[PDB]
Nucleic acid binder design. Structure first.
Ligand SMILES: [K+]
Ligand SMILES: [K+]
Ligand SMILES: [K+]
Ligand SMILES: [K+]
Ligand SMILES: [K+]
Ligand SMILES: [K+]
Ligand SMILES: [K+]
Ligand SMILES: [K+]
Ligand SMILES: [K+]
Ligand SMILES: [K+]
Ligand SMILES: [K+]
Ligand SMILES: [K+]
Ligand SMILES: [K+]
Ligand SMILES: [Mg+2]
Ligand SMILES: [Mg+2]
Ligand SMILES: [Mg+2]
Ligand SMILES: [Mg+2]
Ligand SMILES: [Mg+2]
Ligand SMILES: [Mg+2]
Ligand SMILES: [Mg+2]
Ligand SMILES: [Mg+2]
Ligand SMILES: [Mg+2]
Ligand SMILES: [Mg+2]
Ligand SMILES: [Mg+2]
Ligand SMILES: [Mg+2]
Ligand SMILES: [Mg+2]
Ligand SMILES: [Mg+2]
Ligand SMILES: [Mg+2]
Ligand SMILES: [Mg+2]
Ligand SMILES: [Mg+2]
Ligand SMILES: [Mg+2]
Ligand SMILES: [Mg+2]
Ligand SMILES: [Mg+2]
Ligand SMILES: [Mg+2]
Ligand SMILES: [Mg+2]
Ligand SMILES: [Mg+2]
Ligand SMILES: [Mg+2]
Ligand SMILES: [Mg+2]
Ligand SMILES: [Mg+2]
Ligand SMILES: [Mg+2]
Ligand SMILES: [Mg+2]
Ligand SMILES: [Mg+2]
Ligand SMILES: [Mg+2]
Ligand SMILES: [Mg+2]
Ligand code: NA
Ligand code: NA
Ligand code: NA
Ligand code: NA
Ligand code: NA
Ligand code: NA
Ligand code: NA
Ligand code: NA
Ligand code: NA
Ligand code: NA
Ligand code: NA
Ligand code: NA
Ligand code: NA
Ligand code: NA
Lengths: 129, 141, 140
RNA sequence: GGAAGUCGGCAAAAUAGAUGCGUAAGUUCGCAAGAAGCAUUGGCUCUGAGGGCAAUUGCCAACUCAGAACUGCUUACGGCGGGGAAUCCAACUGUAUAAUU
RNA sequence: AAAGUUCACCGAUAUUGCUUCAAUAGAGGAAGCAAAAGUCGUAACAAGGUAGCUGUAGGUGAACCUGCAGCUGGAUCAUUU
RNA sequence: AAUUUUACUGUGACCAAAAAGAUGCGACCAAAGCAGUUUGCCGACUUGAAUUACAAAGCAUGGGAUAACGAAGCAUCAGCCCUGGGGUUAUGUUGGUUUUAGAAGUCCUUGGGAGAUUAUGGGGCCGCCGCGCGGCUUCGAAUGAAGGAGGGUAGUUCGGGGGAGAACGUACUGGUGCGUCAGAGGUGAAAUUCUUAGACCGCACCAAGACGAACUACAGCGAAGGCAUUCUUCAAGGAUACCUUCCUCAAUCAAGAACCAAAGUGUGGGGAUCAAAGAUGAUUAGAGACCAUUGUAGUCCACACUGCAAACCAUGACACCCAUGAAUUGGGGAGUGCCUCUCAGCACGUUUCUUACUUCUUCACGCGAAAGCUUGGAGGUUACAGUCUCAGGGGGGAGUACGUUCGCAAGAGUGAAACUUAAAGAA
RNA sequence: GGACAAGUCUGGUGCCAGCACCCGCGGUAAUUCCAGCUCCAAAAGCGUAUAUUAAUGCUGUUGCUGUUAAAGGGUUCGUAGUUGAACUGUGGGCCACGUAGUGUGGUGCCGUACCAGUCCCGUACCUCGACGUGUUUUGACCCACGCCCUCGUGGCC
RNA sequence: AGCCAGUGAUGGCCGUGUAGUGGACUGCCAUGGCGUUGACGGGAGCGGGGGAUUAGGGUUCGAUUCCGGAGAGGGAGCCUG
RNA sequence: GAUCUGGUUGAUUCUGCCAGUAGUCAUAUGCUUGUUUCAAGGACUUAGCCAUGC
C-alpha cells in the first residue's frame, strides 16, 4: 500500500518535470507536504500552488516553471548533527554552490543553510536542485 | 486489491460535500430517531435501517440530521446487537458452507473458499477483542 | 528494492553472515580444512628428504621433461613432488639428501605446463640451489 | 591351574529376592528389555507423612512408605534368571510317530 | 603437654564402566578426474537424415529406445468476417 | 490538592598514561624530546597549550519526524458563590472528670451569577372525524468517512468455475438376423494376420466402456494444477450500481497448514479404445530402433498415498506516475429490425464510464550488451533511498557422499569436501 | 615480445636442453632458452615463498545481480518479525519610511488604433465628436521594524 | 532445539558457616527459572588501551613494554602472617 | 590519488573468473654490503626436558 505520502508527492513532481508539463495534481497531501513545498517556493523553484479542499485529505495543484531538475525523499529519515551537514551535501548534491537538503528540526521544517545558521540538527527529509 | 482474492473493484459510494439537510425535508430530528427505534424493534440490522429511510423517507445520511450515527443511537437506547454485524454475517456464511460440505465431500473448491472465510473471522475477532467490543476469551468455535 | 528498515538491522546482519560463505576466498580462511590437506601446515617452507629423481612430461601443446624429485617431508612424513629449477641443477641433488622446499606461487594451484606439481626445490644440503648454480658456493 | 578333557562344556559349578539409578545394535515402532551394568540390605532407640466420629477439643483404627543416631558381621534357613557376538531353518501361539525320531 | 585411638569433612591417585571428539588398518565392491587415442558404434549440432527438450515408468553392449502428460528455447507470430 | 515517560537534536557536567591529531621552541636537519633564551654573572623570563571517546550512563532547551501508555464513548451524567439553621487548643503546671466553639457529615432552606444545546413531549378530561382553549397532576453535542480493508442491498445480473442426480449423441470393438460370393487387411514395396467352417461389404437391431467433433477464437471462468452435450439441483465467487453500515480493522513473511498435470503405489470395481514390458514380420553390414500385425501393466471409477514438470510469462507480492489509434468480454448512464410469453422485452447504430484478456505494420519518451521491453515495464536508477520477502557468487566433482526428517515403496526435503580445470557461457 | 621502462645487435642449441606468476617461446634466421655487448628501473640495497590489506561496486548499509549469462519458491493461507493514511496549530494592529508585485480606483489622456457621427462609395474613402493605451497618482501583499495586544471571543478597566 | 530438580534447579521460612550478604550450606515448604531477540552443545581464542590499510563507509591484526586476570612439570590440601 | 591492465571470437559488444600491481614494528630464505643515529630480538612448534652460578 501507500507508506509515505511525502515520497509519493516528490515522485509525482519530479516525474512531471521530466516530461515537461506545466501543472501537476498531487494526492492525498498533508502538513509535511505543504511545508516542504513552501521551502521550494520561497527559494524560487516551483511557483504558485493551490490547495483544493474536500472533506478528506485534499489535493494540490502546482505550477512549474522549468527550473527544477530533481526532487526526492530520503528514506528512512536518518539523523544529522550540525557537524554532519557537509557529509550529506557531498553525497546527494551535484555541487555545493547550489541545492538544498531539507531537514526537520524542533524549530520546524527548513533547509540546511538556515539550519546551520541557527546551529541545530535533526532528521533529513529530502533534497532538490 | 481485495484482501483474499484477485479482484480489483472500485464500486463504492461518494458522499456529498454539503452536509446540511436540503431544506425541503420537514421530518424533524425527533421524528427520525423515532423511525430508527421503530425499525430496529423489528430486527433490522443497522445497514438495513439506513436503506429503508433512504429509499422511502427522504433521509439520506442520517448523521447529517440528528448528528448521531445509527449504531450510536441503538447503543444509547440499549438495542444494539450482541456481536458486530460484519462478524455475525461472516459466521453465518461459514456455517452454511460447512453444512453443504457434510454431504459433498469432493467439493474441493468450497473447501478452499472455507479456509479463506475462516481466516477472515479470526482476523476480525482479534480486532474486536483488542478494542473491547467482544468479551476477552471469546472464541469462534 | 531490498529491506530498508530503520529497525531492521537484525535481518541485514543475518543476510550478510549467511551469504558470506559463498565466496571461495573467504571460506578458505575460516574453515580449517585447507590447512589439514596442505602438506605444509600453513608454513612458507618445509624440510624433507629426497627419495628418488623422476622425470614428468609437459602438457599437450608443449613437449619436454621437467626433472622433478620425490620428497618425503620430515614434520609429518607426507610425500610430495617438487621441481628443481634452472639448467642442469639435477646433478646437485643426489639421493637421500635433505632439502628445503617452498611453494611455486598461486598458493597450492599447479603452475605452468607441469602436471600437478606445486613445489620447488630451494636449498640442498643447506647451501642454496641458486648460489650453487651461480658458482658462488661449493657443495659440502 | 582353569576346558589343556571330550565327537561335542555332557555332567557339575554358576546367576538369583527387593529397592534406587542406568540400559546398545536392529525394528513391522509394538518391541528388543529383567538387555548389559553399578549401589543398598542385620539389630536396637526414635522422628515424619498418609484417616474416622462426636461436640478448636476429646476419643478411636490400618500397616505402608521415607529419614536419623548408636551398634554388629563368621556375608551365615528356605525359595529364587547365568550373560554376550554371530550363521542356518521355520514368520509367530498351536499339533504331532501311546512303548527308541 | 608429644606418641597414639575413633569419627566427620576436603580429596590426590589407581582400577573398572559408560559417553564424546580426533586420527587409523582392511579381502572385496564402486565413483570421479587425468594420459595415450587402442577397440565398437554414430546419440547431439542442418527438418543432423525418427524435430529437440522437461517430469516419470519400463527395457537394452554403448551412446540410448519406448509409453503417458507438458514446453518452443520450432522447422508455424498468418487464411469459414 | 495537583502532579508524564522515552528516542533525536544544542550546550555544560565525568573521563591515567603511552600511542593519534596537533599550540610553542633550528636538539647543525630529521625520526625525536619537553625543554630552553640572555651580546652577561652571585641573576631574569619562564614553558610544558588545547583536543577525541562504539554503546550505555548523568543535569538541564525546544516539540518538528518519531514509539510507550489510555480509550472503544450510554462504560458518561455531578455547576459556582452567598447566607441562615437543623443535626487540637487553651484554660500557672502534672493526672483524670470536664468545654469553649470550630472543622467535617447529613438534612433543610434564603441572595445572586453561569450552563456545549429551548424544558418540550407524553399521561391528560370535558363541550365545541379533526380542532385550539381551562385547570391542570403525572413522568442532542459527536473530527472526517482515505479514488486503504471488511460487511450489506439489487439486477433472482455474469461465466467450458465446483459438487450431485437423470437422460442424449454419433463413433471404435464385439454379438444377432437377413443378402452376396472370393478375396480382405497393411506398406515405399511386402510379410506376419482374417477368409467357401462364408472373411471384407450392405441394411436393421443389441450390449458394454470411454469421449463430447464442426461452432472453437491472439474468446470466457478459476489461487495455481485445470475447465466444453442437455435438463434438474446444492453451496459459493468476481465486476458493476448505491446520499447503505463500520471506522484503521492494513501490506508482506522464517516456523506451521491446505491444494497440486502425467507417470507411480495399496485395496475394491470396471475393462470398449489405445498401448510401456513381451511376441511375430520387415528394413539393415548389424537393428536390440524407427515402419506393420498384436499384446500385459496402465489408460476409466471410489477410498487412501506420493508431492515432482520447459508446475514458463524461463519475469515474487503490495502501492504511485507515465503518449497515442483501432478492436474485444461483463455491468452501468444518456436512428433501425423482430415483437402472442423466463417480454413494460431482444438485438443493433452514436457518445461517455468502471473492471478484465491484448493488438498497432500509421504507437511515445525512456531503458538495455544486444535480442528486445514500454500504462501488471525489463521506464521513472552513478541525478543511485516507497514497503516486505525468496535466491546467486568462474566451470566441473554434484544435487553426489555422510548424518537426519518424511514415505508401503519408488523417492522427496536439507546438503559438503578431497581433487581437477582457463575458461565455460550470453546476444 | 605484451601487461611494463628498456635491442627489429652478435654467437650456440634445434619441441632437446630450458624459460614462462598469465598470454606464450623452442621442430636450422629463437625480438622470450645458454652467453658477450649495450640499455632500463631503484640503489645499500634488491629478488623469491607464505599469510594479510587496497585494488574488489568479485559480499554491495552508503553500493551488486536474478527474461535469455549463476540466481523468483508450483499456488494460496499464516505466526514471530519488518513496514504502516489524513486531522487538533505556527497571530492582530500601529509603527515610520525604505522597498515592493498584483490589482484597484480615479488623473491627463497625447500619438495611433478603435467607437459613434458627415460627404459618400462599392454594390473605397473624406470630414466630426466618447471607448482602449501609458504618464502620474489610491488598496491590499511581501521584504527591511520598535512598541503594544485579556496575543479569538468574552468579562474587567 | 529444547535446557535445569534423586545428589540445588527458581523462590519462601526460621537456622548454620563467613569478615560480611547470598541456595554458599543443613531441615522443611512451593513449583518454578531460561530459550528462534538463538538458550544447551561444539570450534577458534587470555581482555582492553591500541597496530596495518585508508576519498568515505569498512576489512583485518593485537602472545608482547601500560592496566586487568591466571599459572609455576601434572593435579589436591594446609601452617604462619 | 575517489586511476587500472593481459587471457574466451575469423572479427564485435558482454558476464565472469584466472594473472598482473602497491604496502605490511610480517615471518622466513637467497645474493650483496663503507659511515652514523634510534632500535625488536626461542610467542608461533613442545606451558617440552634441563649441567653449573646468581
Ligand atoms: K490478494
Ligand atoms: K540380546
Ligand atoms: K521419454
Ligand atoms: K459486495
Ligand atoms: K452371413
Ligand atoms: K462431461
Ligand atoms: K506397436
Ligand atoms: K522445481
Ligand atoms: K467477462
Ligand atoms: K502496446
Ligand atoms: K529495437
Ligand atoms: K535427495
Ligand atoms: K556481480
Ligand atoms: Mg585331546
Ligand atoms: Mg547342562
Ligand atoms: Mg536404541
Ligand atoms: Mg537387573
Ligand atoms: Mg515353528
Ligand atoms: Mg516314540
Ligand atoms: Mg521428417
Ligand atoms: Mg545422428
Ligand atoms: Mg534426430
Ligand atoms: Mg603523546
Ligand atoms: Mg472507508
Ligand atoms: Mg459393427
Ligand atoms: Mg458439441
Ligand atoms: Mg493418474
Ligand atoms: Mg491403481
Ligand atoms: Mg486393479
Ligand atoms: Mg493395437
Ligand atoms: Mg538484465
Ligand atoms: Mg540501487
Ligand atoms: Mg560455483
Ligand atoms: Mg610474482
Ligand atoms: Mg618469434
Ligand atoms: Mg582484500
Ligand atoms: Mg512463479
Ligand atoms: Mg514445493
Ligand atoms: Mg502517520
Ligand atoms: Mg590458547
Ligand atoms: Mg599460543
Ligand atoms: Mg602484565
Ligand atoms: Mg565463450
Ligand atoms: Mg615455547
Ligand atoms: Na495477504
Ligand atoms: Na502359549
Ligand atoms: Na619557532
Ligand atoms: Na638534532
Ligand atoms: Na616533532
Ligand atoms: Na512456456
Ligand atoms: Na523456476
Ligand atoms: Na538424504
Ligand atoms: Na547465438
Ligand atoms: Na573502491
Ligand atoms: Na539461467
Ligand atoms: Na618474550
Ligand atoms: Na599464584
Ligand atoms: Na618446564
Amino acid at each position: 500500500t501507500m507508506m509515505s505520502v511525502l515520497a509519493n508527492a516528490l515522485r509525482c513532481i519530479a516525474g512531471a518535470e521530466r516530461r515537461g508539463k506545466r501543472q501537476v495534481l498531487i494526492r492525498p497531501s498533508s502538513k509535511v507536504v505543504v511545508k516542504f513545498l513552501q521551502v521550494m517556493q520561497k527559494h524560487g523553484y516551483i511557483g504558485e500552488f493551490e490547495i483544493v479542499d474536500d472533506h478528506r485529505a485534499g489535493k494540490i495543484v502546482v505550477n512549474l516553471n522549468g527550473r527544477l531538475n530533481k526532487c526526492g525523499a530520503i528514506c528512512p529519515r536518518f539523523d544529522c548533527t550540525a557537524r554532519d551537514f557537509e557529509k550529506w551535501v557531498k553525497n546527494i548534491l551535484p555541487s555545493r554552490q547550489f541545492g538544498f537538503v531539507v531537514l526537520t528540526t524542533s524549530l520546524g521544517i527548513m533547509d540546511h543553510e538556515e539550519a546551520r545558521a541557527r546551529n541545530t540538527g535533526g532528521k533529513v527529509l529530502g533534497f532538490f536542485y | 486489491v481485495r484482501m483474499h482474492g484477485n479482484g480489483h473493484g472500485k464500486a463504492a459510494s461518494a458522499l456529498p460535500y454539503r452536509r446540511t439537510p436540503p431544506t425541503w425535508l420537514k421530518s424533524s430530528s425527533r421524528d427520525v430517531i423515532d423511525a430508527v427505534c421503530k425499525l430496529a424493534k423489528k430486527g433490522l440490522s443497522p445497514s438495513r435501517i439506513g436503506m429503508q429511510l433512504r429509499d422511502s423517507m427522504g433521509i439520506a445520511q442520517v448523521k447529517n440530521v440528528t448528528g448521531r450515527k445509527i449504531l450510536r443511537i441503538l447503543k444509547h437506547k440499549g438495542m444494539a446487537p450482541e456481536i458486530p454485524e460484519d462478524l455475525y454475517c461472516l459466521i453465518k456464511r461459514a456455517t452454511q458452507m460447512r453444512k453443504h460440505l457434510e454431504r459433498n465431500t469432493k467439493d474441493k473448491d468450497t473447501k478452499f473458499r472455507l479456509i479463506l472465510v475462516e481466516s477472515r473471522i479470526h482476523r476480525l475477532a482479534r480486532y474486536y477483542r483488542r478494542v473491547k467490543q467482544l468479551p476477552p476469551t471469546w472464541k469462534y468455535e | 528494492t531490498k529491506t530498508n528498515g530503520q529497525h531492521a538491522a537484525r535481518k541485514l546482519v543475518r543476510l550478510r553472515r549467511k551469504n558470506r560463505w559463498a565466496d571461495k576466498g573467504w571460506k578458505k580462511s575460516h574453515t580449517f580444512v585447507a590447512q589439514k590437506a596442505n602438506p605444509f601446515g600453513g608454513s612458507s617452507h618445509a624440510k624433507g628428504i629426497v627419495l628418488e629423481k623422476i622425470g614428468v612430461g609437459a602438457k599437450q601443446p608443449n613437449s619436454a621433461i621437467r626433472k622433478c624429485v620425490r620428497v618425503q617431508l620430515i614434520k609429518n612424513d607426507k610425500k610430495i613432488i617438487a621441481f628443481v629449477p634452472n639448467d642442469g641443477c639435477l646433478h646437485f641433488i643426489e639421493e637421500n639428501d635433505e632439502v628445503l622446499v617452498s611453494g611455486f606461487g598461486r598458493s597450492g594451484h599447479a603452475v605452468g605446463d607441469i602436471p600437478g606439481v606445486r613445489f620447488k626445490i630451494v636449498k640442498v644440503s643447506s647451501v642454496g640451489l641458486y648460489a650453487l648454480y651461480r658458482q658462488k658456493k661449493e657443495k659440502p
